[PDB]
Amino acid sequence: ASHMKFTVEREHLLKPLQQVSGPLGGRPTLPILGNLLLQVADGTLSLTGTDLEMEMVARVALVQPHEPGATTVPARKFFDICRGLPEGAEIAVQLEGERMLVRSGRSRFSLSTLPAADFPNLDDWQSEVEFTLPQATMKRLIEATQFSMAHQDVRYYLNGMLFETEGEELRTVATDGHRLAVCSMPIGQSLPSHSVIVPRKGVIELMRMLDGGDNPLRVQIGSNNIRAHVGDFIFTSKLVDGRFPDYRRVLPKNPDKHLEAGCDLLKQAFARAAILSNEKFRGVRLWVSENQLKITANNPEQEEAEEILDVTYSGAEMEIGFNVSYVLDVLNALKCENVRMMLTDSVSSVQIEDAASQSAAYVVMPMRL
Amino acid sequence: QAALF
């Protein structure tokens, strides 16, 4: 364990290195958080990156003679060296004193190290629920809602995504207090009930590990941590504390005005109107009348966009204002033929959803224009 | 802009 050494084909290293460098990046703090932990033992090389809140581990099987041990090495420099070597290269790595040597061909790189003993670990924990699902289903759930997470709200429980198991369904919820997205998908297993908040940076990391086609995703949820296994990777994150809002109480109660329109026509009309909306406040005005929607936008310069669209609507006329970016985010996430908007009045939220599917639902709160 | 909660 004192003299780590391994030799591995470049192509078995590149994707693991790229993946484990995900939690890394900006804001130097502890020096060793810019490093990857390398551990050789019993036929396996493990590579780990962490930002203290979450960690990503990749396992690479070692075919060739190796000696056990561990060290840490600058992540980006090690990846850039491996990637810069020619296709098919064999990469021989060994600790020499306080340096890590990387050799291939007549190329030699001697990298600085920091001790493996200094590499931070997440505290140990106990999984309460576990389930396995296709990557495509998790990717659905996250893409349907991720845009509605808050970024830096003082309501820190909003800077993340709720993952909820209920019956046979896995559900995601995201909201920033101005808009909410919820999506649920069947999992094919009866699950205990759990509701946990994954921090927004963990959502992004989870989601970048779903490159794999058909390798399934195994999820374990504890009281304070979540872990996802895909292929040879294991991702673990802390959870966020707090009582996340109940989407069931956020959905508009009995909206009485039901508008249906083509999703692409509606999206393009809002996108053009947005050009002449206020650059900061983004307000657009919707006027609904018999089978018609009018969208208007004005800015401090007194420029004005107006779009009129034929829609399906029978009901009282009303006017309502929205941040057009929030509406465009919903329409971009729907990707369907027809959308349904369900309205109540000018001061109340609206529900937006695919006219043909109820798997996802969106709620947007209006603006007083 | 109004809030949901």
XYZ file of C-alpha atoms in Angstrom:
374
model
C 0.000 0.000 0.000
C 3.066 2.302 0.132
C 4.121 2.018 -3.577
C 1.046 2.472 -5.816
C 1.592 1.355 -9.397
C -0.695 0.525 -12.300
C -0.708 0.266 -16.080
C -3.940 0.769 -18.020
C -5.026 1.435 -21.578
C -5.758 5.101 -22.248
C -9.217 4.314 -23.539
C -10.221 2.661 -20.221
C -9.208 5.855 -18.340
C -10.616 8.747 -20.387
C -14.326 8.529 -19.600
C -13.771 7.726 -15.869
C -11.415 10.742 -15.550
C -13.873 13.068 -17.313
C -16.710 11.925 -15.095
C -14.955 12.163 -11.734
C -13.730 15.661 -12.455
C -17.326 16.947 -12.492
C -17.647 18.044 -8.811
C -14.325 19.913 -9.266
C -13.696 23.331 -10.760
C -13.927 26.914 -9.593
C -13.177 28.385 -6.148
C -9.838 27.142 -4.738
C -10.165 26.331 -1.036
C -8.660 23.145 0.359
C -5.911 22.400 -2.219
C -6.725 18.817 -2.391
C -10.212 19.399 -3.656
C -8.593 20.187 -7.040
C -7.082 16.682 -6.965
C -8.488 13.238 -7.748
C -7.967 10.380 -5.289
C -6.445 7.299 -6.959
C -6.633 4.005 -5.088
C -5.320 0.657 -6.385
C -6.308 -2.592 -4.733
C -7.316 -6.131 -5.707
C -7.711 -5.716 -9.421
C -9.337 -2.263 -9.311
C -8.307 1.368 -9.720
C -10.752 3.776 -8.042
C -10.777 7.451 -8.968
C -12.700 9.916 -6.765
C -13.481 13.618 -7.022
C -15.344 15.642 -4.410
C -16.413 19.169 -3.483
C -17.278 18.144 0.159
C -21.004 18.117 -0.576
C -20.931 15.353 -3.113
C -18.475 12.797 -4.502
C -18.115 10.818 -7.718
C -16.216 7.492 -7.786
C -15.224 5.549 -10.901
C -13.905 1.998 -10.868
C -11.529 0.739 -13.577
C -10.609 -2.941 -13.693
C -6.833 -3.499 -13.744
C -5.686 -6.394 -15.984
C -1.931 -5.882 -15.719
C 0.386 -6.194 -12.718
C -0.261 -3.498 -10.204
C 0.841 -2.655 -6.715
C -1.697 -1.374 -4.186
C -1.641 2.115 -2.781
C -3.201 5.537 -2.999
C -2.351 9.121 -3.772
C -4.013 12.278 -5.065
C -3.049 14.190 -8.202
C -4.233 17.417 -9.894
C -7.393 16.389 -11.738
C -7.327 18.619 -14.805
C -3.618 18.148 -15.493
C -3.881 14.343 -15.186
C -6.921 14.232 -17.462
C -5.295 16.568 -20.024
C -2.175 14.408 -20.109
C -4.165 11.195 -20.685
C -6.333 12.764 -23.274
C -3.373 14.220 -25.112
C -1.696 10.849 -25.497
C -2.308 8.995 -28.773
C -5.197 6.649 -29.371
C -4.386 3.159 -28.043
C -1.621 4.385 -25.690
C -0.776 2.359 -22.631
C -0.386 4.567 -19.564
C 1.930 3.414 -16.750
C 1.467 5.285 -13.470
C 3.480 5.008 -10.295
C 4.114 6.956 -7.142
C 7.764 7.971 -6.744
C 8.321 9.691 -3.392
C 5.915 12.670 -3.382
C 5.484 12.727 -7.159
C 3.181 10.729 -9.431
C 4.841 9.603 -12.644
C 2.819 9.058 -15.829
C 4.664 7.330 -18.636
C 3.676 6.291 -22.156
C 5.936 5.842 -25.154
C 8.770 8.319 -24.689
C 6.520 10.755 -22.802
C 7.170 11.288 -19.058
C 5.108 13.487 -16.731
C 5.943 14.021 -13.052
C 2.907 15.523 -11.210
C 2.719 16.932 -7.705
C 0.691 14.999 -5.143
C -1.108 15.540 -1.873
C -1.551 12.704 0.648
C -4.449 10.307 0.208
C -4.996 10.524 3.987
C -5.997 14.184 3.492
C -8.693 13.474 0.926
C -12.133 14.278 2.434
C -14.733 11.571 2.740
C -18.462 11.887 3.235
C -19.551 10.526 6.589
C -20.849 6.949 6.627
C -24.612 6.470 6.397
C -27.412 3.939 6.033
C -29.655 3.554 3.016
C -33.392 3.283 3.746
C -34.849 2.868 0.241
C -33.313 1.475 -2.914
C -34.689 1.105 -6.442
C -33.456 0.644 -10.027
C -34.841 2.371 -13.138
C -33.810 3.123 -16.739
C -31.479 6.091 -17.126
C -33.945 7.513 -19.660
C -36.636 7.723 -16.990
C -34.430 9.615 -14.585
C -33.327 11.924 -17.418
C -37.027 12.637 -18.162
C -37.801 13.442 -14.645
C -34.869 15.822 -14.178
C -35.160 17.599 -17.571
C -38.878 18.124 -16.989
C -38.296 20.172 -13.823
C -34.640 21.260 -13.419
C -35.156 24.731 -14.936
C -37.559 25.643 -12.099
C -35.025 25.188 -9.261
C -34.005 28.338 -7.474
C -30.331 29.267 -7.647
C -29.461 31.187 -4.494
C -32.730 31.684 -2.604
C -32.488 32.388 1.131
C -35.168 29.699 1.265
C -32.232 27.363 0.739
C -34.543 24.315 0.395
C -35.522 25.773 -3.013
C -31.949 25.569 -4.380
C -32.408 21.939 -5.233
C -34.930 19.407 -6.497
C -37.362 17.295 -4.486
C -37.184 13.565 -5.259
C -40.242 11.719 -3.962
C -41.209 8.054 -4.020
C -44.960 7.411 -3.760
C -46.555 4.047 -4.543
C -45.009 2.904 -7.709
C -43.978 6.337 -8.868
C -40.852 8.471 -8.663
C -41.578 12.211 -8.737
C -39.426 15.331 -9.064
C -40.535 18.793 -7.973
C -38.697 22.072 -8.455
C -39.794 25.591 -7.567
C -38.286 29.036 -6.978
C -41.444 30.573 -5.509
C -42.448 32.155 -8.811
C -43.036 28.932 -10.746
C -43.112 25.263 -10.098
C -42.550 22.102 -12.168
C -43.602 18.578 -11.169
C -43.147 15.338 -13.061
C -43.801 11.751 -12.066
C -43.017 8.419 -13.791
C -43.887 4.813 -12.989
C -41.001 2.729 -11.615
C -42.457 -0.805 -11.754
C -41.797 -1.492 -8.053
C -43.825 -0.639 -4.945
C -41.706 1.876 -2.995
C -41.769 3.155 0.583
C -42.617 6.833 0.799
C -39.638 9.169 0.864
C -39.218 12.886 0.074
C -35.687 14.319 -0.096
C -34.118 17.516 -1.507
C -31.078 17.012 -3.739
C -28.884 20.150 -3.942
C -28.924 21.817 -7.328
C -25.263 21.048 -8.056
C -25.960 17.380 -7.248
C -28.893 17.365 -9.682
C -26.545 18.656 -12.406
C -23.923 16.015 -11.568
C -26.506 13.232 -11.545
C -27.702 14.182 -14.704
C -24.243 14.352 -16.398
C -23.609 10.769 -15.348
C -26.636 9.593 -17.383
C -24.593 9.424 -20.597
C -24.952 5.635 -20.651
C -27.537 4.085 -22.899
C -28.960 0.983 -21.246
C -26.898 0.535 -18.063
C -29.615 0.956 -15.403
C -29.518 3.491 -12.615
C -29.622 2.162 -9.047
C -30.628 4.767 -6.448
C -30.175 4.517 -2.676
C -31.720 7.170 -0.403
C -30.818 7.735 3.218
C -32.055 10.281 5.694
C -29.277 12.758 4.748
C -27.640 11.391 1.578
C -28.491 10.039 -1.881
C -26.363 7.655 -3.948
C -26.694 6.750 -7.651
C -24.910 3.824 -9.363
C -24.541 3.735 -13.139
C -22.137 1.326 -14.786
C -18.754 1.682 -13.094
C -19.633 5.023 -11.423
C -21.050 5.809 -7.987
C -22.271 9.318 -7.150
C -23.158 10.368 -3.587
C -24.520 13.691 -2.392
C -25.613 15.274 0.856
C -29.279 16.254 0.980
C -30.690 19.689 1.760
C -32.518 20.289 5.089
C -35.914 21.982 5.086
C -39.624 21.409 4.422
C -40.016 21.547 0.653
C -43.363 23.007 -0.571
C -46.208 20.568 -1.263
C -46.949 20.721 -5.008
C -50.480 19.401 -4.264
C -51.286 22.690 -2.532
C -49.555 24.792 -5.252
C -51.561 23.424 -8.204
C -54.374 25.917 -8.938
C -57.609 24.868 -7.341
C -60.406 24.450 -9.892
C -59.140 26.773 -12.629
C -62.257 27.686 -14.614
C -60.743 28.941 -17.889
C -59.211 26.350 -20.216
C -57.171 27.516 -23.200
C -55.561 25.147 -25.686
C -53.029 26.189 -28.320
C -50.291 24.796 -30.524
C -47.119 24.510 -28.458
C -44.732 25.710 -31.169
C -46.995 28.558 -32.336
C -47.429 29.702 -28.731
C -43.680 29.443 -28.041
C -42.698 31.402 -31.146
C -45.230 34.118 -30.404
C -43.927 34.537 -26.853
C -40.329 34.427 -28.106
C -40.941 37.279 -30.581
C -42.923 39.332 -28.030
C -40.119 38.881 -25.480
C -37.744 40.869 -27.731
C -39.639 44.053 -26.818
C -40.260 43.232 -23.136
C -38.384 44.932 -20.322
C -34.868 43.418 -20.218
C -34.908 42.992 -16.457
C -38.561 42.417 -15.602
C -39.607 40.593 -18.792
C -43.357 41.308 -18.385
C -45.834 40.409 -21.144
C -49.535 40.837 -21.045
C -51.959 38.040 -22.195
C -55.516 38.906 -23.240
C -57.784 35.883 -23.602
C -61.078 36.116 -25.433
C -63.246 33.799 -27.478
C -60.878 31.495 -29.405
C -58.101 34.081 -29.319
C -54.959 34.971 -27.401
C -53.289 38.374 -27.685
C -49.770 38.804 -26.274
C -48.343 42.295 -25.856
C -44.962 43.436 -24.686
C -43.639 46.918 -24.007
C -40.291 48.265 -22.736
C -39.019 51.530 -21.218
C -38.344 52.891 -24.611
C -41.991 52.498 -25.447
C -41.379 49.912 -28.122
C -44.197 47.405 -28.475
C -44.707 43.855 -29.743
C -48.148 42.397 -30.314
C -49.002 38.829 -31.380
C -52.513 37.562 -32.053
C -53.105 33.790 -32.176
C -56.139 31.656 -32.827
C -56.581 29.295 -29.893
C -59.349 27.165 -28.366
C -60.991 29.124 -25.572
C -64.594 29.664 -24.593
C -65.064 31.507 -21.337
C -64.976 34.972 -19.862
C -62.416 37.421 -21.151
C -59.463 38.199 -18.912
C -56.015 39.845 -18.923
C -53.004 38.476 -17.032
C -49.315 39.367 -16.904
C -46.340 37.009 -16.831
C -42.581 36.970 -16.918
C -42.146 35.734 -20.469
C -38.935 33.858 -19.593
C -40.892 31.709 -17.128
C -43.492 30.938 -19.795
C -40.859 30.196 -22.448
C -39.059 27.829 -20.005
C -42.263 25.794 -19.616
C -42.997 25.663 -23.338
C -39.393 24.620 -24.083
C -39.720 21.774 -21.571
C -43.035 20.511 -22.955
C -41.928 19.645 -26.503
C -45.413 18.528 -27.573
C -48.067 19.380 -30.118
C -50.770 21.122 -28.052
C -50.580 22.820 -24.686
C -53.321 23.506 -22.197
C -53.259 26.589 -19.981
C -55.700 26.589 -17.045
C -56.458 30.045 -15.654
C -58.536 31.587 -12.904
C -58.034 35.349 -12.793
C -55.485 38.070 -13.197
C -53.905 37.639 -9.723
C -53.767 33.843 -9.587
C -51.344 31.231 -10.800
C -51.878 29.359 -14.048
C -51.285 25.681 -14.711
C -49.646 24.681 -18.014
C -49.369 21.190 -19.235
C -49.239 19.008 -22.445
C -52.813 18.645 -23.695
C -52.077 14.949 -24.308
C -50.165 14.018 -21.143
C -50.500 14.572 -17.430
C -47.086 13.173 -16.434
C -45.759 16.724 -15.892
C -47.435 19.909 -14.743
C -46.209 23.473 -14.495
C -47.472 26.367 -12.375
C -46.519 29.997 -13.055
C -47.447 32.886 -10.826
C -48.427 36.136 -12.632
C -47.057 39.638 -12.427
C -49.054 42.800 -11.716
C -48.260 44.881 -14.840
C -43.917 39.473 -9.779
C -46.125 37.633 -7.250
C -45.070 34.513 -5.295
C -46.708 31.047 -5.003
C -45.979 30.831 -1.280
